[model samples]
Target: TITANVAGTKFEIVRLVIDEMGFMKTPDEDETSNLIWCDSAVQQEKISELQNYQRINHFPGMGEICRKDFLARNMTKMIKSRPLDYTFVPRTWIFPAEYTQFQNYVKELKKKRKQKTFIVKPISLIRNSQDHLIVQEYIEKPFLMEGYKFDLRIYILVTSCDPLKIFLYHDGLVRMGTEKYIPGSKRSIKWFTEFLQANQHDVAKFWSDISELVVKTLIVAEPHVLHAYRMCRPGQPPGSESVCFEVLGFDILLDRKLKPWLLQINRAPSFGTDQKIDYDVKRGVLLNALKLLNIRTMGNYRRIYPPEDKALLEKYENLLAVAFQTFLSGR
Candidate 1:
C-alpha cells in the first residue's frame, strides 16, 4: 500500500530508510506514490503537482533559511528590529548590495584590532546580480576540544510550519576538524551530553540554549514557507495536519562562552557514511524522521515548538499570528 517516489535524486541512506520501512518505489510519472523525496529544493510548480495524500521532504519557500543570502537577509531584518532576541547569529552582510556596508564594518574591525577575518561564501553556484556572496564575521574563539575546533550537526524535523510543529532529534553528528584551530571547527546527542558532563558543564541548559536557536531560526522561515504552501495547494491544502515535512540540518558552533551561534542551514545534509558513527547517527536520523512523519514512531525525535508549557504556547500563538499577519500584508 506504501509507494515511495524518488524525484531524481540519489541518496543511499534515504533509500535504505525507506527500504527498511518496506515501501515500494514508484516511477517519476506515477502519481500513486505515498511519499516523495528529492535531493534539491522542490519548486513551486512541483509542489502544486503533489497529490493531497502525498508528502514531500521539503517545504515550498524554505529557501529563506536554506540559502546563504536569504538567511543573512532574513536574519538581518530580524536583528535590526529585535536586536536582543536575534543576537545568536553571527554578524553577516550580503555582497554587492551590502558591499559598502560590509567594507565599512570590516574597516572598523581592522582599526580596532590589527586585522579581522571574515568567512565569505557564494550563496549559490549560479550567478546573477541579486545572487551574491555572504560575508560573516569569523568566530575567533570557538569552543574547542583538545585544541581542535568542532561544530554540531543538529537535525530538525518539521512536520508542519503553520502553527509550527517541529521535532528535534536527540541524536546528531558532531563534526570535528582534522587540524588544530591555529587559524580556525555527532555522535548521538547522548555522546555529546556525556562529553559536556565530563567537562563539568551544565548539559541541560546547554541543550536548552541550542533548542532555542533551532526554534528561532525556523520562525524566520515559517511565514514564507506557509505562504508558499498555501499558494501551492490553494484548494485542498491540509489544515493542522500538513502534507509537507522537512528534515533540516542546522550547523551551529559554540563560542568559548558556550553560546551557540548559527552557522548555516542545509536543505539536504549529507547522509553518506564512511564510518560506523556516521552510519548509526545518520541512519537513526532518517529512520526517526520517516517514522515521525508517518505518525507511527518517534524514536529519537522530540517536538519543541508549540510548547507544552501553556504560557509558552500562548506566547508563540500571539507572536506567530502577528508575524503572519505582517507577512500577508507585506506580500
Candidate 2:
C-alpha cells in the first residue's frame, strides 16, 4: 500500500487495503514472497505501525518532499550558480525566514507598479505555522485582445511501451468560461463560480459557444482520420506538425497577445460527466478506447485470438457485455 507521513499523522488507508487482501508478506517470513511497492524506506515506520511489513519495490531519490522546500532549495541554488539558465514561475515563499524576505520583495515590486500608474492586488499568503508555503506567480500575456478562455481536452490511447502506438480522437471538447476576459480583478478571478450563481436569464448569455471549424480541424489533422477523412472542404485543412503529441490535455490560454499559451499538460483530467460537454467528450473517448482494446472488432479475431481460444473468446465476445448487462438489469 502507498502511504506518506506529514506532521506525524499516519495516513494508513492504503495500507489497510493491502493487509485485508493478505498481501502483506514480510521480508523474514518468506524470501520468495512478493513485496509491496513503496516510494521510500522513510515510510517504513508507517508500514510497521500497520504490521511487521517491509517494502519490496522502492525507487531511490523519490522520497516525498514538501513542494515549498523542493522549489526553494533548487531556486536558491540556481540563483547562485546558474542564474541565466534558471527559469521558473515566480513563487510566493512561505518559510518563516523566506517569507520575511519575500514580503520585502513584494513591497518593492508594488512600489514600482504604483509609480508606473498600475495597481497591484495584494494576494493572501498563509501557511501552517509549522509547514512551509509557496504560491506560484500567475503570469498573464494575453494573446487574443478579447477572446475567451478555452482548454483543449485531447484524448490519446497508448498501445505499446517500446514502439508506441498512439491514436488521438478526431473530436475533443473545448471548455470555456461564461464571462468574457477582464483584466486582473476580483470579478474575473471568480468568473466560473459567478456564472453558476447568476440567474437563468443571465446564464443563457453565458453559455460557451464552439465553432464547427475547430472540430473539423481536429478531424482532418488526426493521423488516423487524415487518410479516410481527407479535405472534403476547402476550409478544413490539415494541422501543422506541432499538433502531434501523445495522450495530453493542453491548457490553452488565448492571451491578449492573440497567441495561445499552452499552460501545462494534464495527463489524466476528470472524465466524469457532470457537464454536457464533459459527458459528450468522455463518451466519444471511451468508445474509441474500447475499439482499440478489442482487436476482434477489426474482423481479425481469428488471426488475433487463434483457434484454440475461440471458445473462450466467444463466451465473453462482447467486452462491454457486463457493463451493458448491469445497466439493463437495473432497468
Q: Tell me which residue pairs clash in candidate 2.
A: 142-255, 142-256, 142-257, 143-255, 143-256, 143-257, 143-258, 143-259, 144-255, 144-258
**Per-candidate local distance difference test:** 0.79, 0.34
- Evaluate model 1: give its TM-score: 0.89
Clashes of each: 4, 10
Q: Which stretches of model 1 miss by more than 4 angstroms?
A: 107-115, 123-131, 183-189, 237-240, 295-297, 318-322, 325-331
Off by over 4 Å in 2: 1-133, 141-147, 151-171, 184-250, 258-268, 274-276, 289-331
All candidates' TM-scores?
A: 0.89, 0.34
Best by lDDT: 1
* Model 2: lowest-lDDT 10 consecutive positions: 297-306
- Model 2, 1-331: lDDT tens per residue? 3221212212232243334344543543233333333322323333222222222221111121112344344344333443332232234344554656766666787777632122122134222243444444444444322255444444444332112133445445555556775541112212432543552223222221111111111211222222212221123334311111123343444433323332333443445555555555555554444344432201111111211356534532232233223223323
**How do the residues 114-207 of candidate 1 rate in per-residue lDDT, one tens digit apiece?**
5666676772221113556677878889988778888888899998876579788887877777888775223555787798899898887787
Q: Distance (Å) between predicted and true CA of 196, model 1? A: 0.6
